[PDB]
Design a protein around this ligand. Structure first.
Ligand SMILES: *[C@@](O)(CO)[C@H](C[C@@H]1CCNC1=O)NC(=O)[C@H](CC(C)C)NC(=O)c1cc2c(OC)cccc2[nH]1
Ligand SMILES: *[C@@](O)(CO)[C@H](C[C@@H]1CCNC1=O)NC(=O)[C@H](CC(C)C)NC(=O)c1cc2c(OC)cccc2[nH]1
Lengths: 282, 290
């Protein structure tokens, strides 16, 4: 299985550049509003908003947490059906990396439990957005702001609220220690089972609390009830109860794979969600 | 550093659904021609027996009217009475083994996902394709010019995939029949592994570097032993920009790879991988890192 991004065309049509003084970054143009990181300012006639080479006149503005909302005099005719959503650690999304308002590439990312993403961003990438697409509706979840000294990345939702304990200052910040996304590893184990790779199944089970206590001792995220629910479809498809798969993973954590492989790998993958596995296996 | 696909907007505007009888798959709508896999009709006798009205072409909700049809190898060409306004500047190209491209996976004319693939030395690709994905295309983008190089036709019993260029000629020994087909034995794209090692350095991973250099002939001896493709002097040149930026000569990186092949990774990772990755070309690395 492979990391698959959503097609980026609905988001491509919304990317513009925003310039204040000599500082240029990316903005997101939906109807007659352009959203961009507020630090571009580091009056209406001080903002140069361009779609390609064409200027969009700014007629008003305001700040919502760490994002600037620029009111423009043209409604984007390419505006898709969309929502702003705040995602949870473990959830995945596509990133359209942009420079000077021009799309450069698309790739799939996961929100780490410490609210960073392992992205691929260069100078001028701020304002690039992350998103999911469900039945032609684009759910925008991420706007890019920062690269940590460790090389991972940090940003906000489209309401300007950072994910994690970060601030939009030119200061070296540190993420909390990362953990493994348990729910995604389990989805990966279900994907193995769906494809016939099932030697790791055992005849034990566990309670959720007992498993969560053990997981935390291996730097694994505890499972939420929401996690148990989104594993539901894969449990039903394979006939393997979620708590039985937890007991199989626990043995894997306590004994290892020997030299054995799962899905042709010796390392457990944790950036595929239960939805990604359903998306891909069907 | 991530596996990065080209933005797919330009190609999404070209995807349509083609239906003939019981069979449905995807087509590519360029100006006033729809290109799709010919097996949608299931030979020359078979096409003759068909008429323009046997073909149902849908661009979203709108039906397009077919006014002509011809066959070019394994690709069917349907002239339609309407030109696609979203037709980008484009060209049809046949890629070389080792080269990469983005795949826009589509189902029923609707784009579904985008990911990066490489043409394997044995002329397969390791894709992610389900029932209904035939007609999906692979492409590269250069300055608003889309170069189409792949149209999807089949999945081998081993799970890898096979297809044609846009002139309808298969990559590799495959045919568009309902048969179990094996590919030749695959090899690893050496020049791409080196590109990726350079990328791991540019991104701060250095544990695999060593003080040794090798010769090109001696490195190729070891490569051939481990089922790696030969490294040519043209490959050394193409790696010039990455060696220049890191200050590590190509033959020095080759000595690091040789040691990696002979000793293994010893349970360490490179760019989070436990395997030597070979589906990044030198240009891919340069495009992403600069
Ligand atoms: C946006 O492009 C900026 O508008 C840029 C994106 C990063 C550049 C390299 N890769 C990226 O993802 N963002 C920044 O430069 C931000 C700007 C802030 C929010 C005002 N700053 C950082 O990412 C930043 C600053 C510092 C730092 O200081 C001193 C020390 C260490 C790391 C660091 N990152
Ligand atoms: C197309 O979408 C057909 O329109 C379909 C795509 C594959 C199905 C599952 N995943 C895919 O990538 N392609 C096929 O079904 C083709 C059709 C041919 C070219 C007419 N056939 C195969 O991919 C195929 C057939 C057989 C087979 O038989 C016998 C035995 C083993 C493997 C196999 N693959």
């Amino acid at each position: 299985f492979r990391k698959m991004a959503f097609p980026s065309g609905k988001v491509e049509g919304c990317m513009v550049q925003v310039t204040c003084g000599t500082t240029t970054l990316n903005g997101l143009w939906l109807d007659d509003v352009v959203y961009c990181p507020r630090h571009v300012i580091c009056s209406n006639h001080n903002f140069l908003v361009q779609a390609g080479n064409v200027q969009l006149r700014v007629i008003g503005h305001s700040m919502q947490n760490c994002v600037l909302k620029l009111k423009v005099d043209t409604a984007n005719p390419k505006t898709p059906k969309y929502k702003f959503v705040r995602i949870q650690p473990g959830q995945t999304f596509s990133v359209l990396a942009c420079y000077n308002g021009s799309p450069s590439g698309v790739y799939q990312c996961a929100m780490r439990p410490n609210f960073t993403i392992k992205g691929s961003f260069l100078n001028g990438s701020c304002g690039s957005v992350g998103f999911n697409i469900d039945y032609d509706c684009v759910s925008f979840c991420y706007m890019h702001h920062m690269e940590l000294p460790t090389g991972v990345h940090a940003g906000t939702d489209l309401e300007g609220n950072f994910y994690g304990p970060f601030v939009d200052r030119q200061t070296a910040q540190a993420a909390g220690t990362d953990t493994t996304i348990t729910v995604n590893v389990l989805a990966w184990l279900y994907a193995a089972v769906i494809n016939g790779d099932r030697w790791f199944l055992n005849r034990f089970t566990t309670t959720l609390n007992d498993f969560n206590l053990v997981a935390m001792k291996y730097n694994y995220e505890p499972l939420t009830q929401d996690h148990v629910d989104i594993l539901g479809p894969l449990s039903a498809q394979t006939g393997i109860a979620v708590l039985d798969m937890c007991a199989s993973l626990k043995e894997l954590l306590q004994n290892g794979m020997n030299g054995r492989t799962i899905l042709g790998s010796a390392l457990l993958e944790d950036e595929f969600t239960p939805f990604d596995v359903v998306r891909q296996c069907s």
